Structures are given as structure tokens and as C-alpha cells.
Amino acid sequence: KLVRLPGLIDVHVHLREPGGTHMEDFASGTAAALAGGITMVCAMPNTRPPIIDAPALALAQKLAEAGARCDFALFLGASSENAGTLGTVAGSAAGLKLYLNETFSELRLDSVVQWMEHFETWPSHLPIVAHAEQQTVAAVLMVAQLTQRSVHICHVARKEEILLIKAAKARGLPVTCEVAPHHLFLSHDDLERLGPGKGEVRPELGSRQDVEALWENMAVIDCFASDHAPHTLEEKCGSRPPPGFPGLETMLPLLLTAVSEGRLSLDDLLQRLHHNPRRIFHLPPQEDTYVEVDLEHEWTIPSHMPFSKAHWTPFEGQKVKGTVRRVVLRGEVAYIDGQVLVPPGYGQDVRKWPQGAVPQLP
Amino acid sequence: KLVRLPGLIDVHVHLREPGGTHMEDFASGTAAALAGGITMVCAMPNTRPPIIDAPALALAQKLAEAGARCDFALFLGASSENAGTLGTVAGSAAGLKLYLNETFSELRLDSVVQWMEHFETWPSHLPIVAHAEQQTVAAVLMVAQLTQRSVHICHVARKEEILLIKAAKARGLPVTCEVAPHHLFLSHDDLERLGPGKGEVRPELGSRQDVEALWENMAVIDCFASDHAPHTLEEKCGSRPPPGFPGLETMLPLLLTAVSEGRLSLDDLLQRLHHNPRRIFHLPPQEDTYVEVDLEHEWTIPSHMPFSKAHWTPFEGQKVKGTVRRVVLRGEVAYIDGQVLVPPGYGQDVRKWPQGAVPQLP
Ligand SMILES: O=C(O)c1[nH]c(=O)[nH]c(=O)c1F
Ligand SMILES: O=C(O)c1[nH]c(=O)[nH]c(=O)c1F
Numbered sequence: 001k002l003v004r005l006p007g008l009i010d011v012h013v014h015l016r017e018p019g020g021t022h023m024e025d026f027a028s029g030t031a032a033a034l035a036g037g038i039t040m041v042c043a044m045p046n047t048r049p050p051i052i053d054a055p056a057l058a059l060a061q062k063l064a065e066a067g068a069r070c071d072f073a074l075f076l077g078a079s080s081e082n083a084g085t086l087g088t089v090a091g092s093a094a095g096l097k098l099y100l101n102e103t104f105s106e107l108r109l110d111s112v113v114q115w116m117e118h119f120e121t122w123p124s125h126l127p128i129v130a131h132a133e134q135q136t137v138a139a140v141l142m143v144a145q146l147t148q149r150s151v152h153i154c155h156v157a158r159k160e161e162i163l164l165i166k167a168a169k170a171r172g173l174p175v176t177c178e179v180a181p182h183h184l185f186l187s188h189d190d191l192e193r194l195g196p197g198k199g200e201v202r203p204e205l206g207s208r209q210d211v212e213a214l215w216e217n218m219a220v221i222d223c224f225a226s227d228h229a230p231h232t233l234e235e236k237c238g239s240r241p242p243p244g245f246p247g248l249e250t251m252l253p254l255l256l257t258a259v260s261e262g263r264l265s266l267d268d269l270l271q272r273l274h275h276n277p278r279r280i281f282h283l284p285p286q287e288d289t290y291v292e293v294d295l296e297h298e299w300t301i302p303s304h305m306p307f308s309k310a311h312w313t314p315f316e317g318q319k320v321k322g323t324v325r326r327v328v329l330r331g332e333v334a335y336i337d338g339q340v341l342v343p344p345g346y347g348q349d350v351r352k353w354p355q356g357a358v359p360q361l362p
Numbered sequence: 363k364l365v366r367l368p369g370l371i372d373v374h375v376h377l378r379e380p381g382g383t384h385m386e387d388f389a390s391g392t393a394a395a396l397a398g399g400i401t402m403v404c405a406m407p408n409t410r411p412p413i414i415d416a417p418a419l420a421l422a423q424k425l426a427e428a429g430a431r432c433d434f435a436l437f438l439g440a441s442s443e444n445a446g447t448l449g450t451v452a453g454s455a456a457g458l459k460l461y462l463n464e465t466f467s468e469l470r471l472d473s474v475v476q477w478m479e480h481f482e483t484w485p486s487h488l489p490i491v492a493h494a495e496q497q498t499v500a501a502v503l504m505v506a507q508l509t510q511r512s513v514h515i516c517h518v519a520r521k522e523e524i525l526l527i528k529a530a531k532a533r534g535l536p537v538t539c540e541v542a543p544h545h546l547f548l549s550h551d552d553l554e555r556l557g558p559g560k561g562e563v564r565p566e567l568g569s570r571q572d573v574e575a576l577w578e579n580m581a582v583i584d585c586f587a588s589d590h591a592p593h594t595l596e597e598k599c600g601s602r603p604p605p606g607f608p609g610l611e612t613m614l615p616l617l618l619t620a621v622s623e624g625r626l627s628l629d630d631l632l633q634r635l636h637h638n639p640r641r642i643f644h645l646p647p648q649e650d651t652y653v654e655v656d657l658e659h660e661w662t663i664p665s666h667m668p669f670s671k672a673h674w675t676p677f678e679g680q681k682v683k684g685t686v687r688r689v690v691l692r693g694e695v696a697y698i699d700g701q702v703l704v705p706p707g708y709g710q711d712v713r714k715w716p717q718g719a720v721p722q723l724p
């Protein structure tokens with residue numbers, strides 16, 4: 001009665017470690033990942049301190065190796081000062097992340113020339129990923145063409161963005177992209193329920209026409225990724241609400257509900273949560289790793305999922321059909337019906353595996 | 363000095379077993395595969411007898427398990443009589459192959475209605491592959507749309523075909539395709555050297571404009587595959603020359619030469635010989651499996667490669683830069699500098715592995 005899936009990959013998560021101000025860490029975030037059927041995560045570099053140099057990467061590597069319950073890779077972050085300085089550690093990271101719109105001071109790039117410098121100095125065979133909204137998508141595509149290499153666009157959220165990427169792909173340009181579940185299953189219509197605090201996210205929630213454009217152009221979407229961005233309700237309901245939603249535990253149930261409704265096929269889902277993440281970021285296989293899901297149980301998303309320390313969710317009240325029953329990670333039972341059974345530190349840095357290095361010419 | 367590649371996959375080979383008239387068999391063909399850096403092959407069903415029913419599949423399965431030196435999956439072949447009869451064995455095959463142009467009597471389909479019947483009865487989650495030339499590509503795409511499922515087009519060889527597939531992909535249609543090395547590295551200009559016998563292949567060799575269109579539209583090509591079709595020179599130079607080239611041992615050296623010349627990147631190559639074959643046919647990973655190549659040695663392709671029993675090659679005289687030095691298959695040294703070190707029967711049917719079944723809804 002259960003369906004066996006491969007180990008699913010989430011290439012866009014914020015686990016807030018290193019850092020001292022948030023409740024989420026590698027241990028709680030990867031517990032949430034396992035409960036969502038996710039056995040490998042790529043963690044973003046906008047931590048405190050941000051992962052913008054080799055010492056910060058070394059610290060984060062050890063914190064994750066000690067806390068992670070599933071396997072992982074860590075992004076490096078582009079800064080106004082580190083272009084040309086990351087060559088010796090670049091291969092050990094998931095890739096390079098550029099924050100091209102709003103971000104905090106250490107990751108801010110003040111000029112497209114700084115984008116160009118990163119595209120020119122980052123090793124050409126390694127992934128580059130960009131937070132790029134609206135016209136910024138076109139701008140970074142231009143920089144990628146000027147430097148003759150590929151780029152991956154995070155969380156595409158608008159009709160404008162997906163149609164631009166569609167046009168670029170039709171001209172044969174090397175661009176891939178990812179879409180997050182809140183931009184497929186939430187819209188402006190939900191802001192009345194969520195309110196202006198909880199509803200804050202970047203890219204912002206789109207119109208009904210944005211959501212319909214993403215579904216209509218599913219063929220253009222290479223990956224799904226949660227953009228798990230945990231903040232507590234104390235932050236979201238405060239005077240300066242930070243943007244972001246938690247999403248590791250809800251993403252697969254939401255997408256399996258869409259499969260059961262015929263909105264996409266099981267294959268469409270597995271291309272975007274397994275095969276394409278593997279090939280875009282050259283993430284290695286996980287031996288003896290699989291997820292068992294139950295597609296019969298209908299349940300309502302509660303006010304908070306059990307594991308993420310965010311302790312809230314914007315999908316509260318939505319009806320879903322699909323449950324993660326069991327996760328096996330490298331031969332060990334990692335999750336069964338609401339209980340995580342692997343300790344912090346079970347997870348490993350996949351870039352240190354022999355099959356986890358990105359191939360390159362000598 | 364050596365470059366480590368993952369285990370490469372060739373999704374289109376003819377190994378002539380079962381059969382009694384050709385010299386190639388599973389043991390010699392998979393030896394040729396290993397020498398070409400290929401650790402997994404998918405074998406086509408136009409054998410003698412053809413794999414068009416469960417008893418023929420059962421025989422071929424055991425012959426391959428006893429003779430194969432690398433891992434494999436076996437295609438089923440569509441016939442005018444077997445639509446609706448393959449449901450119980452379909453999941454054990456690589457996929458279903460339709461011969462929509464020239465073929466021998468048992469695999470001939472006399473009507474598009476017979477194509478429709480196969481698209482309607484073959485399980486919707488399992489791969490369908492088609493030999494479809496020129497307008498036949500458009501026709502089978504129409505049948506795929508009428509039945510609301512995907513199709514993979516074998517050995518695309520013409521500007522006409524790749525531009526049609528490009529247009530279909532731009533409308534979001536689920537079509538993938540493969541291109542063989544002889545349609546990238548040989549053209550009509552080589553028929554003077556090859557002659558009308560050796561030059562016989564289906565799809566036929568294209569014009570210089572066909573070859574240039576395939577390279578210009580590399581973004582449209584999902585996979586490379588050899589279409590290894592061994593015939594001896596006694597057949598090729600006879601009165602009724604059968605179509606086909608051997609190609610397992612030459613494909614990777616040819617493509618690595620193009621990489622060294624900047625015609626495509628190493629990543630472009632590995633998407634088309636590893637990642638995309640995996641995701642289109644849902645082929646499982648091979649643990650502890652990798653290929654070591656030497657990109658410095660320049661050599662001239664001889665009159666015949668050492669292993670294929672075809673004992674000739676159409677690429678004789680071409681200069682290449684790139685050599686397979688070592689292949690490791692599931693922890694065992696399989697090939698080193700011209701010596702195959704795994705015996706017949708080392709290879710396994712990947713569809714029998716737990717990770718090798720195609721996911722499906724209950
Ligand atoms: O780190 C976060 O919380 C965050 N939240 C968002 O909504 N967009 C971001 O780009 C981001 F970095
Ligand atoms: O089996 C063969 O030899 C063969 N040779 C070709 O050139 N085209 C085919 O479609 C084929 F089935």
C-alpha cells in the first residue's frame with residue numbers, strides 16, 4: 001500500500017547555524033527534513049557569521065557534521081570582497097550563492113561589475129546560484145552569457161520570471177531554475193488569512209495569475225526546493241518582520257496532493273526533487289536510501305509542524321493527501337511515523353565523498 | 363593526471379543475443395562497452411528471436427545474466443500482436459521500443475493505430491522509445507500527445523528532426539531524444555571513403571548541414587548513445603548490406619576529443635552519458651563504479667577496435683585525444699589498458715535491483 005521513493009533532495013534550506021539568535025539549527029532542521037521525506041539538503045550561506053570565507057566554511061562544516069541528521073552540502077556566499085579568494089575551498093561547497101536583491105550587509109553586492117567578477121573567478125565547472133527577482137533574472141542571465149557559463153535561478157515566483165527563463169531556454173541558454181511550494185500553493189488571496197507579518201517572504205507571494213503561470217509552465221521548472229526559512233512567530237508578528245516561511249515538513253505532502261489530483265505526475269515530482277537536483281549540483285547518490293509514503297491518508301495541516309523550531313506554518317488549514325511513513329538513510333531507519341531515529345551527527349558532507357566531487361578537466 | 367568520471371550509460375546497443383548468425387554476443391559486446399568507459403547498457407529487442415513476448419524476454423534475461431560483463435537492462439519490442447499483453451513483464455524491461463520505419467517482419471507495425479494501441483496499453487509510467495525518422499518523428503509525437511504521455515526519440519540524425527523536437531520542447535511537450543556519434547562525427551562527405559556498403563546505416567549519414575545543426579542545437583539533445591549495431595565486413599560489403607555501425611569503443615574517445623577542442627564541456631558530456639540516461643529511463647546508480655580517462659594521449663583510430671566482433675569501424679583514420687585507462691564496476695577492476703578483467707556473467711540486470719524499479723502510483 002506504500003509507495004517507495006528515492007531519497008529526495010532539497011537544494012535550498014536555511015538552517016540558521018552558525019548563529020545564536022534563531023531556534024533552528026542543523027539538528028532540528030534536518031529532523032524536519034527527514035520528516036518531510038528529504039535525505040539530503042543544501043544549506044544557504046546567510047548565517048551569522050555568513051559563509052563568505054574559508055574560516056567560516058570550516059566552522060560551518062564541523063557544526064553540520066556534528067548536528068546534521070541527514071546528508072548535506074554547504075553553499076558559499078558571494079560578497080563584495082571575496083571574488084577570486086575562494087578557489088581553494090570552492091570544490092568543497094555545494095556551489096556559490098549570489099544575493100542580488102535584498103540581503104544583509106555582508107552579502108550585498110553594490111554593482112553588476114561585482115557579479116561579473118564572481119562569474120569570472122568562481123571555477124567554471126562549479127554551480128552558481130542566484131537570488132534574482134523580476135528584472136534581476138534578466139540581468140544575471142546577461143552576466144552569465146558575457147562570461148559564457150550557466151546559472152541556476154532560485155525560487156522563481158512570477159509569471160514574468162518563468163516566461164523570461166522559458167524564452168532563454170528556447171534560445172539554448174544554460175539556465176535552470178527552482179520553484180518553492182509557497183509560490184505554487186499560496187497567492188495574494190491568502191494574505192487576508194496570513195496577515196502582513198506572517199505573509200512576508202522574498203520573493204513575495206504572487207497573484208493568482210503568477211501561480212497559474214508557474215503551473216502552466218511546469219516544463220520550464222527544473223527543481224522544487226523548499227526555501228525553508230525559519231523564523232519564529234515572535235519575529236513574523238513583530239514590527240520589522242523578517243521574510244521567509246518554514247517548509248521542509250510541508251513540501252512533499254503538498255506536492256503529493258497535487259499528484260493525486262492530476263496536476264502533475266509522480267515522475268514530474270521525482271525529476272524535480274531527485275534527478276534534476278542531482279545533475280544540476282552534481283550531488284552523489286545515497287546508497288540504501290529511500291522514502292515510503294502513504295497516498296491514502298487525508299489530513300489537515302496544523303498550526304505548526306512537529307519538528308521545525310519555527311513553530312508555525314503558512315499552510316495551516318490546507319487539506320493534503322500524502323504522508324511520509326518511513327525514511328531509510330544509508331541503511332539505517334531515520335524516521336518512522338513522527339519519530340526521528342538517527343541522532344545529530346549521523347549526516348555527512350556529501351562533497352567529501354569520492355562520488356561527490358564535481359568532475360573537472362585537469 | 364587522470365580524470366575520474368562516473369559510470370557511463372549507453373541506452374542504445376544491439377548485442378545480437380539471442381541469435382546464431384552474428385559474432386557479437388553479450389560477453390563480447392559488454393567487453394567493448396567496458397573498453398569504451400561504459401558500465402551500463404540497454405540492449406535493443408531486434409534479436410533472433412526478437413524480444414516481443416515474455417518467453418523471449420525470459421530467455422534473453424538469462425543469456426545476459428550469464429554473459430554480460432557490465433550491468434544491463436533489456437528492452438521489449440512492440441509488435442503487431444503484443445499490445446496489451448506485456449503488462450506483467452513490462453516493469454522488468456528497460457522500456458518499450460517501437461520500430462516505426464524499416465525493420466524485419468516481427469517488429470513491423472503496419473498502421474499508426476497500432477502505435478496508438480501500444481501507447482494506450484503500455485504502462486504510462488514506463489519508458490517508450492521510438493526509431494522514428496523525418497516525418498515519423500512528428501507522427502509519433504502526435505500519438506504521444508493523443509495518449510497524453512512522453513516519448514523518447516532514438517538517434518536523431520537530421521536538421522529536420524532536431525528542429526521539430528526543439529519546437530515541441532518549446533511548447534512544453536514531454537519529448538526527449540538521443541544522438542549517436544556517427545551523426546556528429548561523420549557526414550555524406552565520408553561516404554567516398556566508406557563506400558556504399560560500409561556507409562549503410564539507419565538513420566543514414568546526414569549532410570554537413572545536418573551535422574552542423576545537431577552541434578548548434580546541442581541544448582536540445584538529452585542523451586548520447588552509440589546505437590552499437592555490429593555487423594561483420596562480410597555483411598557490410600555484401601550484396602544486401604545491413605545497416606549499422608559498431609560504436610561502443612569509439613564513442614567516448616570521439617566525444618572527449620570534442621571536449622578538448624571546446625565543442626562542448628565536460629559537464630555537457632556527462633549530462634548526456636550519465637545524468638540524463640538515469641532520469642529518462644530511471645536507471646539506478648552503480649555503487650563503487652567509476653571510469654578513469656587520459657585526456658593527453660593523441661592516437662589514430664585503427665581499422666578495427668580490439669573487442670567488438672564487428673571487426674571494423676567507420677571512424678578508422680580519425681585522430682582522437684582521450685583514452686579509457688581504467689574502469690571499476692561495483693568495487694572490482696573491470697578494465698585496464700586494453701584488458702577486460704571481469705568474466706562473462708559479472709554483469710547484472712539493474713531492473714531487478716530494489717533501486718532499479720520505476721516508481722509508480724499504487
Ligand atoms: O534567510 C531568510 O530568512 C530569507 N527569507 C526569504 O523570504 N528570502 C530570502 O532570500 C532569505 F534569505
Ligand atoms: O539492428 C541493426 O543492425 C540496426 N542498424 C541500423 O543502422 N538502424 C537500426 O534501426 C537497426 F535496428
Ligand SMILES: [Zn+2]
Pocket residue numbers: 131154155202203
Ligand atoms: Zn532567496
Ligand SMILES: [Zn+2]
Pocket residue numbers: 012014044227229
Ligand atoms: Zn533562500
Ligand SMILES: [Zn+2]
Pocket residue numbers: 022230231232235242
Ligand atoms: Zn529570523
Ligand SMILES: [Zn+2]
Pocket residue numbers: 278279281282283632637
Ligand atoms: Zn554529476
Ligand SMILES: [Zn+2]
Pocket residue numbers: 282284354355356357358359
Ligand atoms: Zn562526482
Ligand SMILES: [Zn+2]
Pocket residue numbers: 493516517564565
Ligand atoms: Zn534504430
Ligand SMILES: [Zn+2]
Pocket residue numbers: 374376406589591
Ligand atoms: Zn538501434
Ligand SMILES: [Zn+2]
Pocket residue numbers: 384592593594597604
Ligand atoms: Zn548483421
Ligand SMILES: [Zn+2]
Pocket residue numbers: 270275640641643644645
Ligand atoms: Zn528515477
Ligand SMILES: [Zn+2]
Pocket residue numbers: 644646716717718719720721
Ligand atoms: Zn527506482
